Symmetry: C3
Subunit: 270 residues, 3 copies
Amino acid sequence: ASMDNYIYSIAHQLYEMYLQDEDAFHSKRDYPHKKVFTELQKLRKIFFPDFFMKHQKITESHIASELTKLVDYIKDSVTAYNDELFAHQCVMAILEKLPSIKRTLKTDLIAAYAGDPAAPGLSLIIRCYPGFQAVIVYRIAHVLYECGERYYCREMMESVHSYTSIDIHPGASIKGHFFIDHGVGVVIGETAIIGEWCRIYQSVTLGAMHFQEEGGVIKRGTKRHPTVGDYVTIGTGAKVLGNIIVGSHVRIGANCWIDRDVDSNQTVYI
Amino acid sequence: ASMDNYIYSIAHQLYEMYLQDEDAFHSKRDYPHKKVFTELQKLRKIFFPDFFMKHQKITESHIASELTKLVDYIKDSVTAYNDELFAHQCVMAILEKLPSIKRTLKTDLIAAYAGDPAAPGLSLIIRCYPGFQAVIVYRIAHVLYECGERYYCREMMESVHSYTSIDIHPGASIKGHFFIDHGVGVVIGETAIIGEWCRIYQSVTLGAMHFQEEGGVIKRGTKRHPTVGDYVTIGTGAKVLGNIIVGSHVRIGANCWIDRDVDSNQTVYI
Amino acid sequence: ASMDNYIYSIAHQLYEMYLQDEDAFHSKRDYPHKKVFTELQKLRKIFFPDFFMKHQKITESHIASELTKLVDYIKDSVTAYNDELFAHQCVMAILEKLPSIKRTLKTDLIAAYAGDPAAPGLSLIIRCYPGFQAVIVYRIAHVLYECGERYYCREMMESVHSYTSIDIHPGASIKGHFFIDHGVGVVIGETAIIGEWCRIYQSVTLGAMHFQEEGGVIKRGTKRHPTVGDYVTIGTGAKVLGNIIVGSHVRIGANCWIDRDVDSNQTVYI
């Protein structure tokens, strides 16, 4: 039970982080029960227990129990697509990263409240903002991708895709204070890199298109989606395509078609 | 049981309205059973019983029973986010408005059939048109918002968002004969105002974008989304942003980026 | 049990096709169990049993059993909206076409792998690519439409719409080697015709818009959506509207608004 002993240590760290979180990340309310797909259902309970438990139930031992449920689930799925040893390794990698992911998700909530005049408090963002639900699962799927996994991490993100219409490839690399508002139609590709304080609206693509060539069979992988710096806002409907760099402090306008580098500190519109 | 006595009176009024509805809003067919999220599942049965019951079951007493189920559900959720007294008030406000909402939803079905060459009859629109499912729940969520509620009404609309990819803030104000066709990617903001006979397509935003400012924390609320008059058609992909006024009898073209006032009786294209 | 005898013959043909499929369409892995809407759940098991059964269970008799479940389900739904005799006819039409649909879906998987650098193998596309899930159900819904059915086939595609945000009318006519990548926001209309090797991205419309006329009640049906030739790629956000013809070997750019004929062998951008 070496993985079980590692689960206990991580559940302990996450519980101490919960005890020390600011009041804005806490509540005494017992919120309505919901049932969403497994990965999100579990990660919700683990990161933000006040909002998805059951105040009477909120303890280190219950965090550990839900974490064990999640671990068994992901281990079984990664084993199914790969093998038992690779699945063990990858899940130990998820467990190791959960405290850092918790810290990042707090920054993501901060950016969501900060970027949205319609948000009354963090509790609503935690409970139901779809950009935030997507990001929760994304940050865990990305650890899988970083372990070299290529199948289950995509299936996990396809659950996010069905639930929110937000399409983030598990290989995308995204920094903190990240916010997708509204979110339907957002597509972020396998090799996308996104810096800190990125704000993205509905129908935004940070992606690529591939015009048919014969047909042959397109080259697999390679860096082919945009790299986006810090403090970038991408307006509703903007399509940013190809292996291009958008600099820091860039504002992109609605419906823009961007296929070349955009230098820092400027506003693009037509 | 004062609220129970009010439920009976409203269920009676809705039942008499059902008896008096035109043939187009009735059917003798027993349609396939479906299970969708609670608010829609219940509101479907209450407004359009022929299409979601169980012909043998269709009586005043069954309308009352489903209405009670819906009331208990929404009362519990509003209580969870707020308090018991506020929840009582808000739900009494929903109950009071249900007969008017029923009348409006009939106009919405009229506009859907009228605006869609692919619709064979109202029954299909009632049973499965996603724009119409969204509008059913929207009209009830908006009564909550009008009572001053800011949390559960958004969660209700996030259920609509997941189910249909149509994103309507419960604070939006929308008149009758309303139709969203196709609907994926539609975003309608908290302070949007939409007049009568509005026809909206997929990927339309009546919304706002907020370019990052430092960062600081954006001002909460205020009128900041468009106001749209009567007989307005907004084409696929159009992004209408900001506190701007679009007049009556306006046609907006595909992919348009609209950020200033548009006067009545004109067509916008590029 | 004439329909049951026809089911056996079709299940036999599909089983022999499964035995003869290339290695790429097979797996020995027992993949994680999922539960999606009935039509997709069943069609998945029938066409690609290795990926959705239960290796121990994969036999002619189990293909037959799932096929019977699917047939009873669709027969009941078509009967509900129409009548028992019409439902029998239409379902016998589905059964007759299943071997050809299987062959076509193999070409669709080929085009998906070929057109997507992020796809590691056909198994992932079969298991979770949303464009492919949509196409599975579309090819069956279209047989219903071809039988003259106008209600349940749309409800089936509305399930696809909720699950994937891809909106394909069952009347659309689409050839093989078809691929929708990402797919959120794709709309393909009742009278659309799409040739071989079509590649379509997120937020693409092959559709129509109808500006309000008075209001009157718009003419029902008629050819009113585009006809697209072979080897056509339609970029993210492109809106192709009206009864127009796009030729073969055409590449359409991001966010394009297309409302007139486009001749073969050219690239459209602005």
